[PDB]
Amino acid sequence: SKLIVPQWPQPKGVAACSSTRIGGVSLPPYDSLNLGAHCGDNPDHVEENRKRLFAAGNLPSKPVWLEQVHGKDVLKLTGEPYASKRADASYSNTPGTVCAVMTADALPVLFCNRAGTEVAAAHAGWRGLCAGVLEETVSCFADNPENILAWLGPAIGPRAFEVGGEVREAFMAVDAKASAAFIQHGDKYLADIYQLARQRLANVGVEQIFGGDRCTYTENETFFSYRRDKTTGRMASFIWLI
Numbered sequence: 001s002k003l004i005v006p007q008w009p010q011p012k013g014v015a016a017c018s019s020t021r022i023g024g025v026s027l028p029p030y031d032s033l034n035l036g037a038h039c040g041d042n043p044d045h046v047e048e049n050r051k052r053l054f055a056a057g058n059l060p061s062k063p064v065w066l067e068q069v070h071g072k073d074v075l076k077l078t079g080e081p082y083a084s085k086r087a088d089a090s091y092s093n094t095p096g097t098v099c100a101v102m103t104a105d106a107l108p109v110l111f112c113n114r115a116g117t118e119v120a121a122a123h124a125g126w127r128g129l130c131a132g133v134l135e136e137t138v139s140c141f142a143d144n145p146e147n148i149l150a151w152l153g154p155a156i157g158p159r160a161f162e163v164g165g166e167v168r169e170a171f172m173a174v175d176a177k178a179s180a181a182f183i184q185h186g187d188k189y190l191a192d193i194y195q196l197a198r199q200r201l202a203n204v205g206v207e208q209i210f211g212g213d214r215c216t217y218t219e220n221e222t223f224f225s226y227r228r229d230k231t232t233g234r235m236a237s238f239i240w241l242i
């Protein structure tokens with residue numbers, strides 16, 4: 001359907017999906033399954049798209065949408081209501097609870113342990129990726145990273161992700177080896193976000209890494225892209241214990 005199913009050795013206890021722009025009600029340039037409430041779309045259309053998502057994904061409960069600020073804070077999903085959802089990642093060990101990260105070029109990373117008793121979702125735009133959102137998400141697991149699986153969701157691929165030296169400086173400041181992921185391209189660099197994610201995951205001992213095959217910018221029939229469209233919708237990536 002509209003939904004991507006992660007190609008990873010997913011535990012029996014785990015369910016996951018990642019939305020596309022297909023199968024909603026929003027008009028261009030939000031066309032059609034826009035899940036974003038802060039990008040200037042009709043709030044009634046977004047509401048209806050979030051309902052279509054809930055049904056298409058057979059989610060057991062409403063996704064816990066975060067107040068994403070492109071940082072490295074993780075929200076442990078211990079039960080609604082929540083005082084503050086100011087975070088760029090969520091962690092769950094609670095059956096039926098849905099971790100959700102909202103993107104349109106930023107890397108969504110979905111995580112679970114081999115046992116299929118812990119899950120998480122992280123929003124890794126370059127700012128949060130650089131800051132350590134993936135490392136902070138992995139550090140919320142009780143299980144050792146050797147037993148953690150990660151799935152690199154649809155993000156802006158290295159064909160498309162032109163950045164200035166400012167972004168390269170920021171990553172190399174934290175871990176010089178990030179240099180490998182930035183390739184000179186005119187007066188700017190092409191950044192490999194999947195490569196930077198693989199670096200950070202390896203840094204905390206996550207070795208079992210899947211996905212990384214998509215490009216939100218290039219695959220315009222399937223994804224919104226902030227870089228491509230500027231005014232556009234948002235996809236989201238979801239994981240839960242069944």
Ligand SMILES: CC(=O)N[C@H]1[C@@H](OP(=O)(O)OP(=O)(O)OC[C@H]2O[C@@H](n3ccc(=O)[nH]c3=O)[C@H](O)[C@@H]2O)O[C@H](CO)[C@@H](O)[C@@H]1O[C@H](C)C(=O)O
Nearest residue numbers: 103104105106125126127162163164165166167188226227
């Ligand atoms: C992290 C990521 O993939 N994208 C995020 C990033 O956009 P980005 O597109 O990178 O914009 P920039 O940060 O302003 O710029 C980052 C670097 O890239 C250079 N550049 C930018 C645009 C261009 O055409 N050419 C070019 O070279 C610029 O000069 C700087 O060095 O920042 C936006 C807020 O400003 C976020 O909304 C967006 O998140 C999305 C929605 C999401 O959460 O899914």
